[PDB]
């Protein structure tokens, strides 16, 4: 019936002044735009059809044509920025926001989806959707005692659209927008649908990606324990944004980092052996921002047995993960006590550390040499530089620190030098 029309035929029927004729052409349009292979987005734009689709959104007494046009505009806006811009320039934003009030759940769902595709283009379209007043009627759709009485697919669409309103920096979303969305967002973060949880953690991870005062708005709402719970999900599409959000919060103040520790987060990090390389990476990254904190927080790292896990990740891991581990160690050795640094050496940090001095990356080597000297400072404070110096010797670390005098980078070669003449003379 409406299967593969030409864009010429669609134009003829939409330009008829026959609402039923237009309904059929609009659906032929939607079917074109929703095929797997190369939907003709540009052909439809160039045919001039976008303003007619937007106008069809208003046709209250023909909800089928509202539905078809909304579907069609959704898919045009799912494309390139210029394609999405074509939909906005057609006046679709006030029109989709009106549709949020539809009595038909499949219409409003399609309205939700398109606003998501528009807000996803970036900060300006995001902010522009908010300025047109999308938030109030979006949250209204979720004003029910129990989310569980809403349709599954309907719920996941809203959550996704709500994360895109939380997304992108330069600038971050309006603060009042964030405060208006955050409570409902906390409610989705406790819903039991795996896809809703994933999309909510993404949103929370965006909101915590920025200045400490952004992080503070999230921590203030008490979401951290539930982030820690989701940090231990079996479902890796959940673990991934939960970890990113946790990693974001610990870049804040020590008090904010302390609330991650207080919620039990360190118990899940034995993350550091996850089969998925990026989880291992982001977990080590988080660990380096926790060893950068206070001595009592370093001590909490020690007490959870996490130091043997950093030795492990230093010994064998993807090299990007190892580079974070070297950062974690240098931070630990910068802020830790003598006892804590001594503990590090007893756990076997020395050998895996020396072997990465063979790396090409210049920052990892200056980070590693940094760590060594903090560790030699501790050995002096104990009258014990000698024994450590021999450990570095026996496993062939001296060879490395020697050869690092040849290094082109200036901070490198003066670093190794200082080490050899101060403790290897």
């Amino acid at each position: 019936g409406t299967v593969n029309w030409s864009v010429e035929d669609i134009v003829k029927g939409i330009n008829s002044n026959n609402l039923e004729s237009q309904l059929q052409a609009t659906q032929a349009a939607r079917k074109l735009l929703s095929r797997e292979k190369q939907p003709p987005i540009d052909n439809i734009i160039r045919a001039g059809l976008i303003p007619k689709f937007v106008s069809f959104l208003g046709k209250t007494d023909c909800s089928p044509i509202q539905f078809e046009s909304a579907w069609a505009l959704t898919n045009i806006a799912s494309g390139t920025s210029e394609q999405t811009k074509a939909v906005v320039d057609g006046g679709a934003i006030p029109a989709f926001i009106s549709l949020l009030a539809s009595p038909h759940a499949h219409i409003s769902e399609q309205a939700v989806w398109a606003l998501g595709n528009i807000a996803g283009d970036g900060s300006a379209f995001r902010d522009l959707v908010i300025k047109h007043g999308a938030i109030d009627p979006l949250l209204a759709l979720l004003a029910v005692p129990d989310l569980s009485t809403l349709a599954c697919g309907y719920l996941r669409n809203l959550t996704w659209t709500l994360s895109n309103l939380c997304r992108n920096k330069n600038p971050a979303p309006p603060l009042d927008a964030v405060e208006q969305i955050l409570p409902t967002l906390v409610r989705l973060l406790h819903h039991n649908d795996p896809e809703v949880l994933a999309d909510s953690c993404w949103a929370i991870s965006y909101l915590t990606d920025g200045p400490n005062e952004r992080i503070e708005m999230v921590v203030k709402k008490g979401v951290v324990p539930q982030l820690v719970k989701l940090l231990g999900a079996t479902e890796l599409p959940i673990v991934t944004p939960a970890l990113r959000a946790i990693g974001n919060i610990v870049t804040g103040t020590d008090e904010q980092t302390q609330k991650v520790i207080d919620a039990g987060a360190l118990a899940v990090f034995p993350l550091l052996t996850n089969p998925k390389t990026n989880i291992q990476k982001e977990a080590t990254w988080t660990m380096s921002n926790i060893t950068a904190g206070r001595q009592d927080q370093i001590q909490q790292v020690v007490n959870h047995g996490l130091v043997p896990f950093l030795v492990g990740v230093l010994s064998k891991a993807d090299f990007k993960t190892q580079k974070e581990a070297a950062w974690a160690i240098t931070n630990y050795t910068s802020g830790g006590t003598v006892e804590q640094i001594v503990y590090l050496v007893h756990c076997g940090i020395i050998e895996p550390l020396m072997n990465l001095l063979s790396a090409k990356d210049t920052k990892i080597i200056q980070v590693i040499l940094d760590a060594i000297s903090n560790i030699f400072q501790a050995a002096e404070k104990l009258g014990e530089t000698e024994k450590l110096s021999i450990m570095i010797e026996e496993c062939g670390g001296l060879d490395k620190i020697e050869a690092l005098q040849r290094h082109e980078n200036e901070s490198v070669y003066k670093a190794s030098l200082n080490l050899i003449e101060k403790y290897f003379s």
């Binding site: 735009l33 929703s34 797997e36 939907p39 959704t74 799912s78 999405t84 595709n117 283009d121 994360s163």
Partner: peptide, 9 residues
């Protein structure tokens, strides 16, 4: 997180 999404129903 997907940035935009095309519907295929």
């Amino acid at each position: 997180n997907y940035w935009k999404r095309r519907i295929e129903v």
